[PDB]
Design an enzyme around this catalytic site. Structure first.
Site, PDB file in Angstrom:
ATOM      1  CG  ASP A  97      -0.008  -0.423   2.939  1.00 22.70           C
ATOM      2  OD1 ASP A  97       0.847  -0.143   2.784  1.00 22.70           O
ATOM      3  OD2 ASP A  97      -0.950  -1.303   3.187  1.00 22.70           O
ATOM      4  CB  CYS A 100       4.931  -2.780   1.027  1.00 19.05           C
ATOM      5  SG  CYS A 100       5.493  -1.733  -0.710  1.00 19.05           S
ATOM      6  CG  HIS A 237       5.790  -5.988  -3.298  1.00 19.91           C
ATOM      7  ND1 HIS A 237       5.420  -6.841  -2.777  1.00 19.91           N
ATOM      8  CD2 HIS A 237       4.350  -4.833  -2.030  1.00 19.91           C
ATOM      9  CE1 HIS A 237       4.651  -7.242  -1.759  1.00 19.91           C
ATOM     10  NE2 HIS A 237       3.711  -6.072  -0.946  1.00 19.91           N
TER      11      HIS A 237
END
Length: 336
Positions: A97, A100, A237
């Site tokens: 989000d 992370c 990510h």
């Protein structure tokens, strides 16, 4: 499948205990120096023996807890687990989000994520109240050793990107994206090196230097914690690349284009480039290892940084509670 999608779920009562113990274990002086942790920055998580169970069942434990999309991708590009002479690092599932980065760094050492945003709020209230002269100088050094295109204004922009509250919703995302200079600070606050294991394969689609070591350079040396936090960055990510419980260490080199290339070390001035080898060992526990070389038959020698031992007491360690969970579920697995 009765196995939780994450670790901290297993015992949310312990997860909350952790969350509650986290801003308590943060030291707060007010004289121009950054905020940091007391004891908890020394914690470290290590994933459990998954190969001990039957393979019909290992899949159940894997698919739930491990980020197969990122573990594959990192492995598949000779950047994750490439060294047969060293233990395997596994990627755990973080809530992507835009916070992370933090969800991973907390996961790496508590098992919980930054769900109460103490870390995000730490970073946000650090930049603002403490002296940040040292940090700006470094940032506006990497920044014009690249791009070339107003750097005085872009700083106050980076801190409000680090806003505690929702920004303009990027993709409906919760929180605003973080970058290289943020990872540096978080190292410093945790007084603990961070090693990012970044994607190198971006060839076809219509150019970042995120990966590398991040060192607590605002802070002095071995007095800090000299055992790395290892993170994996693949797409947009962050995952914690958590070791388990060969000898445990992470390579300080890169297997690319047929050569062992050093990992980038971020935000370094010309004088520190000569210290760069000696800047580690002071800040890590470097140790040489005969990795298999470029086939044919030559053990090539390179360095690596030993990782930390699992030291979370069962008072604040979640993995141990998960492990119990998977055991009983396997005990039924053997009833039928």
């Amino acid at each position: 499948q009765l196995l939780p999608q994450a670790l901290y779920l297993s015992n949310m009562r312990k997860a909350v205990k952790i969350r509650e113990r986290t801003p308590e274990d943060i030291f707060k002086p007010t004289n121009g120096i950054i905020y940091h942790f007391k004891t908890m920055h020394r914690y470290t998580l290590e994933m459990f023996r998954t190969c001990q169970f039957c393979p019909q069942f290992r899949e159940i434990i894997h698919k739930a807890l491990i980020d197969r999309s990122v573990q594959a991708s990192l492995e598949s590009q000779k950047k994750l687990n490439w060294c047969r002479e060293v233990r395997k690092l596994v990627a755990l599932k973080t809530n992507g989000d835009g916070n992370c980065l933090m969800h991973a760094a907390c996961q790496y050492m508590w098992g919980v994520q930054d769900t109460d945003l103490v870390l995000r709020k730490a970073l946000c209230s650090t930049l603002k109240e403490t002296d940040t002269r040292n940090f700006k100088f470094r940032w506006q050094l990497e920044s014009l050793k690249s791009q070339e295109f107003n750097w005085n204004d872009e700083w106050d922009n980076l801190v409000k990107m680090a806003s505690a509250d929702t920004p303009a919703a990027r993709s409906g995302l919760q929180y605003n994206s973080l970058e290289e200079i943020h990872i540096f600070v978080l190292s410093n606050i945790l007084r603990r090196p961070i090693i990012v294991i970044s994607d190198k394969m971006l060839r076809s689609l219509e150019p970042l230097k995120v990966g590398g070591i991040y060192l607590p350079l605002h802070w002095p040396a071995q007095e800090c914690y000299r055992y790395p936090i290892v993170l994996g960055y693949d797409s947009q990510h962050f995952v914690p690349l958590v070791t388990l419980k060969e000898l445990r260490a992470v390579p300080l080199v890169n297997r690319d284009r047929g050569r062992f290339e050093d990992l980038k070390v971020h935000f370094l001035t010309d004088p520190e480039n000569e210290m760069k080898e000696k800047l580690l060992k002071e800040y890590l526990i470097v140790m040489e290892i005969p990795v298999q070389g470029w086939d044919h038959g030559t053990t090539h020698l390179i360095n690596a940084a030993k990782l930390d031992e699992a030291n979370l007491p069962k008072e604040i360690n979640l993995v141990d509670d998960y492990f119990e969970l998977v055991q009983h579920e396997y005990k039924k697995w053997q009833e039928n």
